[PDB]
Ligand binder design. Structure first.
Ligand SMILES: O=C(Cc1cccc(Cl)c1)Nc1cccc2[nH]ncc12
Ligand SMILES: O=C(Cc1cccc(Cl)c1)Nc1cccc2[nH]ncc12
Lengths: 304, 304
């Protein structure tokens, strides 16, 4: 028992990290097979970042201008192309450490692990959620661009995020591995509105089920609610409206604990209306929304 | 910017994990050079666990009774010995993935990463603290015994913990890599008192400095305090007494922010006496003590 904000083991991703330098800029790249993926802003100088003309900046670059280093060994670049906001550097050697992998575009409210890197070297790993507004609240310093987010299903790494930018608000924005930003963001040094965010209701409910499984039960009450009534409360408290699709994904946790989803909704309703009263749930004094129902089941069943 | 409960990249440790089976019991082992380390209770049956006679149980075992499997390949066991609460299984092949490593006994209040494993396969990685009472609040299910805790300083893995037991209270106990338990625990299925725990004051202060560095400043006040006055408050709130040694380790963070350690102590004093008033610090609604001053500097400087 016990419940932690657990990340996937990062080894399979550590073996893919490289350093990419173009001119004066260094960031991280992801080496899979014979391609290195990295943020296209590796080609910018500070003078360029207010609104870079990426097409023109890339025309001034040749294969030999992209310095790619995998630990201590240099990779030979034999092609380059820009796809949306990523560059794809074709190299003459397939990464021997390439794991089985997929590129996936995750949905808002889903979670993933981030391997924060600097100069192609891994620094640390943490778990986070893609907010409903498509930002991430990460831990990224200058030089972390090109670090990736991923999930692992047995031996397959599904890469879902590449880090590109820290907005002036201190929240993070990035792309899928085809270089499409999550959210409305653009790769320019400008203030950019991130939408209104909401709390991921189905994840808070999953975490309340994790709490019951792991011994924290004080918040269970004698009440029930309906989706309509619960959604009036979710509206007031800026929580995502709950749907039958969310109730269905909570089915396994409802079956494991014997607590009907709408009864757990009534516990969440009381917690939203009354607060925690100075108590904690799974070591937290707030309602946690960074665990999906799949994460809770995986953590409570010991999936490897 | 941003601050997360970050674990070390686990790849170097993933390469050391093996499955050890003895009779009907399977758990995890750590393969370094030509030795596999695992909890000695791998030799017990359920009938043995109330108070096992480990010496007698191990006398009934031969090298060929210890089944060690590294992924899909079987290791040949050419020796066995019990050291405190660990078994050391000498194998005929040095682990090719053995990283540079050390065995260290950590101090209470220090932090480390855990690579939770089942059947020798990594499941996930998380960061935690060794409580002042020598327990850990982990995420461990049955089959996780033998999972290890570690820190990494550049290319060297310092292994500090091997998981052995979940106490009836749901908290975790284990040993250093020489098999000495942290705390008063014994490897038997009995209720065992864990001491009175306290909050790790120097880590809460480090985390308040991380909060100021990362933009959360609302808790800064016009006050100062002394070590004596602060320690009266720490006493009331079950916090570890602060010493000049703790003030000295907070020196770098004090220099980075320009906030004297005793002024930060006055902010912590007000937070202990008044609570958070429904506000958060670094996404937490409680005072976090699982980040050391070294962790805060490492995370805020991008060490790889
Ligand atoms: O965000 C950027 C580069 C950049 C600026 C504008 C647009 C783009 Cl696409 C890229 N550098 C950072 C500086 C400081 C902390 C940081 N955390 N994560 C990144 C990061
Ligand atoms: O703790 C043990 C085995 C054991 C019992 C008594 C003494 C010893 Cl040394 C070992 N099994 C577990 C069962 C369920 C969840 C668990 N989490 N971590 C372990 C764990």
């Amino acid at each position: 028992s016990g419940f932690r904000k657990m990340a996937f083991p990062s080894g399979k991703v550590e073996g893919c990290m490289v350093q990419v330098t173009c001119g004066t800029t260094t960031l991280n790249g992801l080496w899979l097979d014979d391609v290195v993926y990295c943020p296209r802003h590796v080609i910018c100088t500070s003078e360029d970042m207010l609104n870079p003309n990426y097409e023109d900046l890339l025309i001034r670059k040749s294969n030999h201008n992209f310095l790619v280093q995998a630990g201590n060994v240099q990779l030979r670049v034999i092609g380059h192309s820009m796809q949306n906001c990523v560059l794809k550097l074709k190299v003459d050697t397939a990464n021997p450490k390439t794991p089985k992998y997929k590129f996936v575009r995750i949905q808002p409210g889903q979670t993933f692990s981030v391997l924060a890197c600097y100069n192609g070297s891994p620094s640390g790993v943490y778990q986070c959620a893609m907010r409903p507004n498509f930002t991430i609240k990460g831990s990224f310093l200058n030089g972390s661009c090109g670090s990736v987010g991923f999930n692992i299903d047995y031996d397959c790494v599904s890469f879902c995020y590449m880090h590109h930018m820290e907005l002036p608000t201190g929240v993070h924005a990035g792309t899928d591995l085809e270089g499409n930003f999550y959210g409305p963001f653009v790769d320019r040094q400008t203030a950019q509105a991130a939408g209104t965010d909401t709390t991921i209701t189905v994840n808070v409910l999953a975490w309340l089920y994790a709490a019951v499984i792991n011994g924290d039960r004080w918040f269970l009450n004698r009440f029930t609610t309906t989706l309509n009534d619960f959604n009036l409360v979710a509206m007031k408290y800026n929580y995502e409206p709950l749907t039958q699709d969310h109730v269905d994904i909570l089915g396994p946790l409802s079956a494991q604990t014997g607590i009907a989803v709408l009864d757990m909704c009534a516990s969440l309703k009381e917690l939203l209306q009354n607060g925690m009263n100075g108590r904690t749930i799974l070591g937290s004094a707030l309602l946690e929304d960074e665990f999906t129902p799949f994460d809770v089941v995986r953590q409570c069943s010991g999936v490897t």
